[PDB]
Structure formats: structure tokens, C-alpha cells
Amino acid sequence: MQDIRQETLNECTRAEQSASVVLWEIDLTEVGGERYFFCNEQNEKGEPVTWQGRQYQPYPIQGSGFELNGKGTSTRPTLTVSNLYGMVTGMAEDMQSLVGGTVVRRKVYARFLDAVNFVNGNSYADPEQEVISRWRIEQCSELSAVSASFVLSTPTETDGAVFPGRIMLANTCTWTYRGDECGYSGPAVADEYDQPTSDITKDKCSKCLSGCKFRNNVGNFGGFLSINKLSQ
Amino acid sequence: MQDIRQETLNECTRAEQSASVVLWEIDLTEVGGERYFFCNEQNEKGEPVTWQGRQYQPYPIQGSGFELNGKGTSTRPTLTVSNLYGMVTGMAEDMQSLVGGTVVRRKVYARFLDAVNFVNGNSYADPEQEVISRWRIEQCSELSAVSASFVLSTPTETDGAVFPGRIMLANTCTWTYRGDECGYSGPAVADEYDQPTSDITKDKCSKCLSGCKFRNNVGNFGGFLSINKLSQ
Amino acid sequence: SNYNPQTRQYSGIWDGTFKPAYSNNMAWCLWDMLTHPRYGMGKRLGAADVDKWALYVIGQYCDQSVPDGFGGTEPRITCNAYLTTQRKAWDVLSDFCSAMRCMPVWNGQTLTFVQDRPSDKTWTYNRSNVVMPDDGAPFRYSFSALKDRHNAVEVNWIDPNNGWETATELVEDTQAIARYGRNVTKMDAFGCTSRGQAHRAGLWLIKTELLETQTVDFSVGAEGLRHVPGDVIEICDDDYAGISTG
Amino acid sequence: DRHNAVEVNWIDPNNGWETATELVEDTQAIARYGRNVTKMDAFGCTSRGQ
Amino acid sequence: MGKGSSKGHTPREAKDNLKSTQLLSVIDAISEGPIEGPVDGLKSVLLNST
Amino acid sequence: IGPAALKAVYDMARKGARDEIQTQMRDGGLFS
Amino acid sequence: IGPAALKAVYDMARKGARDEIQTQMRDGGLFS
Amino acid sequence: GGMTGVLFSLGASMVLGGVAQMLAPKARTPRIQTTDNGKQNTYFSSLDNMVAQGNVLPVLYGEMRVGSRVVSQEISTADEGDGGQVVVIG
Amino acid sequence: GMTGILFSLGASMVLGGVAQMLAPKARTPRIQTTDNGKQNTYFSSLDNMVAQGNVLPVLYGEMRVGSRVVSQEISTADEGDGGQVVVIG
Numbered sequence A, B: 001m002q003d004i005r006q007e008t009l010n011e012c013t014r015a016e017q018s019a020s021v022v023l024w025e026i027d028l029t030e031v032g033g034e035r036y037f038f039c040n041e042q043n044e045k046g047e048p049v050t051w052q053g054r055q056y057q058p059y060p061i062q063g064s065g066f067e068l069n070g071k072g073t074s075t076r077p078t079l080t081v082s083n084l085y086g087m088v089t090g091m092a093e094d095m096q097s098l099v100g101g102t103v104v105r106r107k108v109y110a111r112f113l114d115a116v117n118f119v120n121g122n123s124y125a126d127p128e129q130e131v132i133s134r135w136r137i138e139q140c141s142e143l144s145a146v147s148a149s150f151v152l153s154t155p156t157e158t159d160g161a162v163f164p165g166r167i168m169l170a171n172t173c174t175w176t177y178r179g180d181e182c183g184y185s186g187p188a189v190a191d192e193y194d195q196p197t198s199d200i201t202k203d204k205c206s207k208c209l210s211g212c213k214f215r216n217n218v219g220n221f222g223g224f225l226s227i228n229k230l231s232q
Numbered sequence C: 001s002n003y004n005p006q007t008r009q010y011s012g013i014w015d016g017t018f019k020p021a022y023s024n025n026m027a028w029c030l031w032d033m034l035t036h037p038r039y040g041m042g043k044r045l046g047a048a049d050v051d052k053w054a055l056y057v058i059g060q061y062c063d064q065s066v067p068d069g070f071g072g073t074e075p076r077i078t079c080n081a082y083l084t085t086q087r088k089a090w091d092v093l094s095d096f097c098s099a100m101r102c103m104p105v106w107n108g109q110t111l112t113f114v115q116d117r118p119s120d121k122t123w124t125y126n127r128s129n130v131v132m133p134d135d136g137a138p139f140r141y142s143f144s145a146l147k148d149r150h151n152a153v154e155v156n157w158i159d160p161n162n163g164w165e166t167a168t169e170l171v172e173d174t175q176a177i178a179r180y181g182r183n184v185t186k187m188d189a190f191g192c193t194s195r196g197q198a199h200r201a202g203l204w205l206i207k208t209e210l211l212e213t214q215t216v217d218f219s220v221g222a223e224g225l226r227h228v229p230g231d232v233i234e235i236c237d238d239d240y241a242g243i244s245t246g
Numbered sequence D: 001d002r003h004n005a006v007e008v009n010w011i012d013p014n015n016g017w018e019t020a021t022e023l024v025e026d027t028q029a030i031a032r033y034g035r036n037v038t039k040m041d042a043f044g045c046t047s048r049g050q
Numbered sequence E: 001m002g003k004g005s006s007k008g009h010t011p012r013e014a015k016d017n018l019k020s021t022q023l024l025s026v027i028d029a030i031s032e033g034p035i036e037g038p039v040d041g042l043k044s045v046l047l048n049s050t
Numbered sequence F, G: 001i002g003p004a005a006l007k008a009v010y011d012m013a014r015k016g017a018r019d020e021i022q023t024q025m026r027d028g029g030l031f032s
Numbered sequence H: 001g002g003m004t005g006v007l008f009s010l011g012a013s014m015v016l017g018g019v020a021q022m023l024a025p026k027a028r029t030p031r032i033q034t035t036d037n038g039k040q041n042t043y044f045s046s047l048d049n050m051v052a053q054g055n056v057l058p059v060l061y062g063e064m065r066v067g068s069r070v071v072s073q074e075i076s077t078a079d080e081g082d083g084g085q086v087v088v089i090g
Numbered sequence I: 001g002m003t004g005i006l007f008s009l010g011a012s013m014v015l016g017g018v019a020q021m022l023a024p025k026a027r028t029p030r031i032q033t034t035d036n037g038k039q040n041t042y043f044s045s046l047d048n049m050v051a052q053g054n055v056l057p058v059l060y061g062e063m064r065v066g067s068r069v070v071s072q073e074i075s076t077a078d079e080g081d082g083g084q085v086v087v088i089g
């Protein structure tokens, strides 16, 4: 079942429907950007649509192909955004072509927007009735000088991933630096090529036996010292 | 070469041919139904078409793709019948989607029908000139409230089947009870769950060793008592 | 925490708490596979992206004490697996779901699983709630295929009794053999260490293949669209096929 | 599609002329995107450097 | 005994005049993460299926 | 109109290709 | 006309899909 | 753009593979070898020692005695010694 | 006259990868369970094979490798390599 309130479900029974409104939120905090709020249309005052107090500005956005299924391939709906004045290209050249971000689609009925969107003022406003979905941007299939097409995907979709992440190595580590297994917290001692530096900005392990010996954590080495198992 | 008589072959080369009638026979006797006779069109008396004495009633029918080929996949012609008044669904709900039945297509020229189909009476009547084809229904891909589509297949179609159909050993049997291989013909002694049942209405064999022992036919047991060929 | 891994008895309401303990359960095996760092692709998806309550319901369903052939009492499905080869994540996920007879969907912006567990009807539809596009008939039915209806299935399972070796057990129906042809199919039961579980899996496959043979497509108005999330149970009250007035 | 972890199979004349797998990855690509592992043998390789 | 680490031995039986015997020592990796011990004691070790 | 016709042809050439893929891999085709 | 155009486009799409399958399975391509 | 023509319903187009496939995603059988004869090994059993060269470390979920991946094998001379001082070699 | 439907395909090719647009990438062999967990090399054959199915191979540098045996035969040797030094006792 869905988290649909009783009031909106009851309203979604009558013949004389209201106007469906779709609003989009592009979240880039996890990738290094900001939160952008878009709406396909504006109110009667020629103003950004106000919902839950926040404002969605008008911009041509169109999402097509939302197909949830359990078999076959995954779902890859398409989002089209007008690229005029180079606005999309500006963030694309900066945010690595909008790869890894999140998109949230909220759909609302017209009779529940804030009262400031209507000259008479809606008395039926209720800023808690909407339907929410989230997806992740996969690629920018085409961004011309007039438009831009993004492919969407489910966050939990598996593609190109293998289950047994463990890999057996001979003289190379397998985990990160200082994360969980390299319980190192002392001063910087080494760098990429195992040089005796003492600066923290250049401290990165070489993923070798010599790096471990330098950092005195050879007891936590991921590379088994077999090597000569296939020669004999 | 076909078994077409000389006279129809002679007529088929004529410049001014006659109407080509197609008649259909659906046989479900091998499934547990009856014989249904259909014709796409009726005579001039507003009556079912009389051929060889029997009557084909005028009902919706239309076939497409009937063909004989050797390369690639086998041919699967498609039949279509209009489902009005719920007539097709009536037999579909009772005969398990009409799968496994037989369809016979007869092709005849108009100038050989019975004399009762013409007001003046056809003197050129000879009820032994026709072309016969036979197929089997495979699936019903459409049973809408307006029509019904059936897929046809060759009787000798092979797929999803393996040639050497035996599985070496098993703790269970592989024959059929009361056949020409099991060889048992005695009174009821056991049931499906291996209980002392003396009633023949629900006699079944668990195909296992104890069930076979219950009937003193362990000599004809199909499973081999190896088991330990893999463990040891 | 609510779960006891010794007698598999639940007691009280469950919270989002966890306890590190041994287990032999199945759904929580998938949970450990899916959301785990280091080796279980936990870096791709967080803990909040998967419906843990559906997993809890599945795990509660996986311990029902079904009767076995010898007269004992054992759980329905139990995971005993040793994954020793690298393979695609989707393959392992599909194997797990097939063993559990479940299917995964991205429903309600959270990955969830749906199984063929009997439940109560959610909604009802008649001809007035659907649309005839152009042909006048809104409901569109279809059936399975004769060569597609399997009647004999051979399943491979590991037999701990003899030598921890593979063994094939076959299941079939006499009446199905009499009605249709014989359709043999092979299957590998995932993590099976008991003849009863393999037999139950084969019987479920043949039964759910012999009974459920009708699939219908239709259309739905916008009001009922969001109302039905998906993978739910309902009734299609049709007055055209029932030759009556629903 | 953007791979950042690669395993290369090369023959190792030093030990026993046996196959050996060498791993290469970038930490910053791990931080920015996900981890994408790909295997490919280095055809004709006879030294770890190559 | 289970818990996280365990050890066990069987009494060596040899003697009978001065000699020199071999000693095969091998390490095996079973699985990953916190595993539990054998269902029984040191008997669970199966050498040549016994 | 153009784009409607183009989208119609594109979506029509989908199930055709899918059915072709499915039939050519069944028994005696090229297995896709 | 509707149905004639629909059937023609469907058959042409099937022919195109068959031709694509034939041409992509020669030596290279994606080896369908 | 207001209308959405070509609804293109999918019914038996997905049934054609089988009906249980759309409720359960089936399982993948291993490839059969010839030199292996008839021992149909599955993907969750291993009763022999494997080699841990550029491979993955297997996981275990419950019971089911398994083999391993050998990391170091070595033979030395067995020195005389016990947990004590009793070292008689007579 | 006009030549419509260009249908630019720059996007479709990248879908399989970008490094493949400049390098065809090396092929990889399959893994046989029977050959334990060893990985087969595509450019070296240490084992000495049988001269029949295997095509006459080619060498390109170093690589102590096996061969394809054409004739193996075991007999009784002579007592003495040559010369007049032919002692036995």
C-alpha cells in the first residue's frame, strides 16, 4: 500500500478533477552541489509556486517513462530539461555532468496549494498531501544548445557489481586508508611513492608491503604472502 | 505432390474461377469435448452451408499465415474468431483454453457445393474434391469481449523435449501405475500416501520403494538402488 | 532483537533494533547479503533504501513448521549456502528470490519484496472504472501455452545424510500427465539440505503452474492509479465474461 | 560505466611463468563515484610494470 | 570450545628408536566475517573424509 | 504532425523487435 | 487508413529487426 | 501531446516464457563438463581444497561442511617437544 | 533530393563504455572448474600438448613453454656413445 492520506484519496474519486501539478527537486549535496527546485508551470500571479512554504520556480521540465516492475530490466525513465542561455551547461561543466545526484518528484492536486497562489485564497489548503518518488541520475544522454536529456535509475539497482567483494592478493592491500582496517592515526610518514614526508596533505599509502612496514601496521595487511602457490 | 483430383486441378487453371470457400472443423474428442463446424460465409438461401451432407453453420472465423516451411522455426498460423455473446469464453472456461485440440481446414471451390445451396441446383456437384490441412491449438493469446485469437502449431512440433527420456537411478520409480511396464493388475492395496486402502476409486502409488513393496512387484522397479555412487 | 534464533519464536512488537547473533534463517540471509559494507555492496545503497519490514514478514513466514515425509516438524525453507565463485549480483539476488518464491520491486521509493502469500482483497473493479480504448472491449485476457505448462520437474539438492553430494529428486502429477503432455524441466533449489524442502519447491512450482493460467491486462483511471501501489491482490468484477450483471 | 578498479592478468617469468593478477585503482574516483571493478588480461605482458 | 579463538591437540605417539619424522603444516581460509566455530570439538576436522 | 508520427513509429518498432527476438531464439532460429 | 498502415509498419519493423540480427552477428559488433 | 496513442498492451508477450517465471525469477543451473563425468556440482558446495590466486574469498551461511582455499603449505622436520619436560625418546 | 533522418548515434556508442572507443580491449578466456582455480593464459602454454587438434603454434619471444608431441617411443639403449671406449665392467 501507499502512504496516501484519506482526504486526497477521497478527493480522487469525484468526476470533476482538479489540476495535477508536478514539482521536482534536484539534490546534489551528496555530490557537492545545492538543492534546485523546479516546477513546469507558475501560478496565476506570474510567480513561483509556493508549496509547504518553499518556492518552486518555473522551468520547462518533463518526465516520461516511469515503469516500476519486478522482472526484465530495471526502470530508466527520461527527464527532459530546456537548456537555454546555457544554464544547464553551467552546472554540467562543474558538477561532472550531473552524475550521482538525486531527483525527487512530488505530485500534488491543485486544490491543496498555498493560499498565496490564488487571488481569492484557497480555504482547502493542506501542505501534507502529495506523492513522492526518488531516483538517481545515471547519464546525460544528450545536452544540446536547446535541451538536455537525463536518464534516471533506481538507487538500489545492481549492474556491473559482483557479490564476493573480497579479492585475494599477494603484495597489495585491499581496503582504504585510515578507514576501518588500517587503524592508523599517527603523523603522516609516507606518500604515493614511499618517500619520507611529514606533510598531511600528501599522505597516501602505496598499497604495498613497504608502506605497511613504514606505518607499523603490517599485522593488518590484506595481502596474503602466498605468491609461490602456482610455481609448485 | 498432393492428392488433389484431376478435375479440380484442371478447373484451378481456368481464367474465370469461382468463389473459394474455407470451412473449419474443431475437434476436442481427444480432450473431452465435441466436434464444431464453422464457415465464414453462408449460401444464398440464408442457411448453413451443406457439404458432404453435413452442415457447417455460418459463424465468425478467419485464418492467417497458414504455410509450410523447413528452415528456421516451425510455422505458427493464427486463427481469429469473434467472441460475441460470450460463446467462445463458454467453452474456454470448460475445456482449459482449448489447448491440445485439433483444427482441420478444408478448402473447396464454389462450383462443387451441394445442390441445396443454389436455387437452380448445381449439376457440377462432386463432394470429394477439397484440400485438407490439420493443426493443433497451442495457446489463446486474446480472449477479449470482442474477439478471440488462437495460435496454431504442427502436430509433430518438437521443442522443450529431450530425446533420451530416462534418468538412471532414483529412490523413486519412473513408470506409470497399471501400464504395460509396471505390470501390476491386482486389487487395490495402497493409496497415494501409503495407507491400507482397499478402494479402487483412489488407488495411487507413491512411486517409492515401500509403495512398490506393497504390491509385490519389486522386480519391475525402475529405480536403481545405488545411492552411494557419489558419496562413495 | 525480538527474534530468538534457537526456537524461532517471536514475542512482542518489533522495533528497528538489531542484535548480532547466529542464525539459520533465510530472509535475514538476504538482508546480510544486501546491506553490508566491505564485501556486500553496502557502499552502493544505504540501510534505509530496503524495506526491512517486508523482510521481517518474510522471515516470520519462513518458519511455519511444515510436516516432513519422515513425520517430523521442520521449517519450510532454510539457507545453507557456500558461495565460492564470483558472479553477478543480480544472479545471486534472483537465486535468493527464487528460493523464497519472492519478487523484488521498487515500490514506494523503497526496494521491497512480494511473495505469493494468500491475503485479503484490497480493491474491486468493474466495467465502469475502466476504459475501452477503441475496440469496445476494455478487459484483455490471455492464457498460457500447452508446451509451457510443466508437469515433471527434477530438482537438485545437497544430501547431508549420505556424503554431502548432489542428488536429483523428481516430482510430477498423474492427472496433469493424462490431460496435457509430459513437460520435463530441471531446477536447482538454492541452499537445500533436506529432501522435504526440495519436494515442496517442486510441488509449488508445478501447482502454481497448473492452476494460475489466466492473465488479464486493462486500464485504470488516474484516481485509482496512485491508489494501487503494485504487487497487490484485488478483484476484477467483469459482467461481460460472467454473463450477468455485476 | 566509468570504471576505476581494474585487474590485469600478466604472466610472471620471475616466479614460475604463472599467471598473476595486479590491481589498479584511484582513491579520488572511489570518493567521487562508486567502485566499478573490471577484469582484463594484459595480452603479451611479461612484466608487472607493463 | 567455541568463542572467537580455539586450539586443540592429540597426544603424539612415536618413540621406538631415534628417527626423524616429517610435519605437514597448512593454513586454510574458510569464510569471511565473524563466523562460528565447529558444531562439535576438534573432531570436526576431516582428513581424507575421516 | 511530425513528432507524434516519429514517436508512434519508434514505439511500434519496439514490440515487433521484441517478438522477433523471442521467436528467433525458441527452437530452430539463430538464438538472437 | 489505420489498420493497413499499422500492419505494414509492423511487418516492416519485423523485417528490419531480422536484418539487424543477421548483420550484427558476423564477426564483430556487439555479437547479439 | 495531450493524448497518448498506441497503448500497446502486453499480455501473453511476457507469459510466453512461462507463468511461474513472472512470480519467481527461476535459478541458474551450472554448466556441464565432460571430464567431470556426471558429478553435477552446484554453486553452494565445495568439498575440495581450492587455490587462492586472484580469486574471491568464499562466504558461509549455515552448517554444511566445506573445503577451503589453501594459502600456505609447508613441510618441515618434526622436532621433539611436548607441553612439558617429559621428552623421553627411548 | 533531400536526405533526411540522419539520426546521430554519438550517444548510443558510449553506452557500452568509452575506453572501448579507442581500444578493442583484450579478450578473456573462460574458467574450467576441473582445472581447479588456475587462470588460463591466452598467450602462453606451459604444458606440453598433443600434436593433433592443436594448430601448429607460433612463438614471439622468451617463454620457456611446452610443445605438441609428435612421436614418443621407448626402446633399449646401446652400451657406449661412440669411439673405442666401450667398457662394461
Ligand code: SF4
Pocket: A173, A174, A175, A176, A177, A178, A181, A182, A183, A205, A206, A207, A208, A211, A212, A215, A217, A218, A220, A221, A222
Ligand atoms: S597497506 Fe598496510 S597501511 Fe597501506 S592501507 Fe593496506 S593496511 Fe593500511
Ligand code: SF4
Pocket: B173, B174, B175, B176, B177, B178, B182, B183, B184, B205, B206, B207, B208, B211, B212, B213, B215, B217, B218, B220, B221, B222
Ligand atoms: S513403484 Fe513398483 S508399483 Fe509403483 S509404479 Fe513403479 S513399479 Fe508399479
